[PDB]
Design an enzyme around this catalytic site. Structure first.
Site, PDB file in Angstrom:
ATOM      1  N   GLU A   1       0.840  -1.189   0.000  1.00 48.66           N
ATOM      2  CA  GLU A   1       0.000   0.000   0.000  1.00 48.66           C
ATOM      3  C   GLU A   1       0.882   1.248   0.000  1.00 48.66           C
ATOM      4  O   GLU A   1       0.684   2.156  -0.800  1.00 48.66           O
ATOM      5  CB  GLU A   1      -0.897   0.048   1.242  1.00 48.66           C
TER       6      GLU A   1
ATOM      7  N   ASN B   1      -6.598  10.406  -5.693  1.00 49.26           N
ATOM      8  CA  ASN B   1      -7.483   9.604  -6.530  1.00 49.26           C
ATOM      9  C   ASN B   1      -8.244  10.469  -7.533  1.00 49.26           C
ATOM     10  O   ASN B   1      -8.359  11.684  -7.361  1.00 49.26           O
ATOM     11  CB  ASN B   1      -8.451   8.812  -5.651  1.00 49.26           C
TER      12      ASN B   1
ATOM     13  N   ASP C   1     -11.327  10.833  -8.038  1.00 47.01           N
ATOM     14  CA  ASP C   1     -12.543  11.447  -7.514  1.00 47.01           C
ATOM     15  C   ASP C   1     -12.276  12.604  -6.544  1.00 47.01           C
ATOM     16  O   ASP C   1     -13.196  13.096  -5.888  1.00 47.01           O
ATOM     17  CB  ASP C   1     -13.398  10.388  -6.819  1.00 47.01           C
TER      18      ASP C   1
ATOM     19  N   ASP D   1      -5.500   9.098  -0.417  1.00 50.08           N
ATOM     20  CA  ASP D   1      -5.197   7.983   0.478  1.00 50.08           C
ATOM     21  C   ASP D   1      -3.994   8.433   1.295  1.00 50.08           C
ATOM     22  O   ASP D   1      -3.000   8.900   0.729  1.00 50.08           O
ATOM     23  CB  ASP D   1      -4.844   6.719  -0.316  1.00 50.08           C
TER      24      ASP D   1
ATOM     25  N   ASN E   1      -8.375   6.230   2.978  1.00 50.42           N
ATOM     26  CA  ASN E   1      -9.067   7.225   2.153  1.00 50.42           C
ATOM     27  C   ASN E   1      -9.872   8.326   2.845  1.00 50.42           C
ATOM     28  O   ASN E   1     -10.626   8.071   3.782  1.00 50.42           O
ATOM     29  CB  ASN E   1      -9.961   6.489   1.155  1.00 50.42           C
TER      30      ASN E   1
ATOM     31  N   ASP F   1     -15.594  -3.122   9.237  1.00 50.12           N
ATOM     32  CA  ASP F   1     -16.732  -2.577   8.506  1.00 50.12           C
ATOM     33  C   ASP F   1     -17.456  -3.530   7.559  1.00 50.12           C
ATOM     34  O   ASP F   1     -18.210  -3.090   6.693  1.00 50.12           O
ATOM     35  CB  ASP F   1     -16.310  -1.307   7.760  1.00 50.12           C
TER      36      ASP F   1
END
EC number: 3.2.1.17
Length: 129
Positions: A35, A46, A48, A52, A59, A101
């Site tokens: 990562e 990113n 959008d 990160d 994120n 999650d």
């Protein structure tokens, strides 16, 4: 800061990541390796508009506040700058929430594509834990 392999392993073990939610220490070290390449200051912008952050590339659209991602959330209740600290406490605590999650460690794309299913045990090879 750029962590050494065993150095990171020890720090993660110290923060209770070994076997957390059923994922052995090796999984977490491998995740960090692909990562962020063990770089606490790593950042990835990113498409959008989100970013990160840190050792585990968490994120900004959902987990932290960086003040530059419109319409986003901050579920870990922390500024993203905290995820860039040489002290991995913030990243670890937030990661524990993320892995709980509902998707396990699949939340980490790099881990899924290079760590899942492999002999992750090799990542703590020769460490004094």
């Amino acid at each position: 800061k750029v962590f050494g392999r065993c150095e990171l392993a020890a720090a993660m073990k110290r923060h209770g990541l070994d076997n957390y939610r059923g994922y052995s220490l090796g999984n977490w070290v491998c995740a960090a390796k692909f990562e962020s390449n063990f770089n606490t200051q790593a950042t990835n912008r990113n498409t959008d508009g989100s970013t990160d952050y840190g050792i585990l590339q968490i994120n900004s659209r959902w987990w932290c506040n960086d003040g530059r991602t419109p319409g986003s959330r901050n579920l870990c209740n922390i500024p993203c700058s905290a995820l860039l600290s040489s002290d991995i406490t913030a990243s670890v605590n937030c990661a524990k929430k993320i892995v709980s999650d509902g998707n396990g460690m699949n939340a980490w794309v790099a881990w899924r594509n290079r760590c899942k299913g492999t002999d992750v045990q090799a990542w703590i090879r020769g460490c004094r834990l």
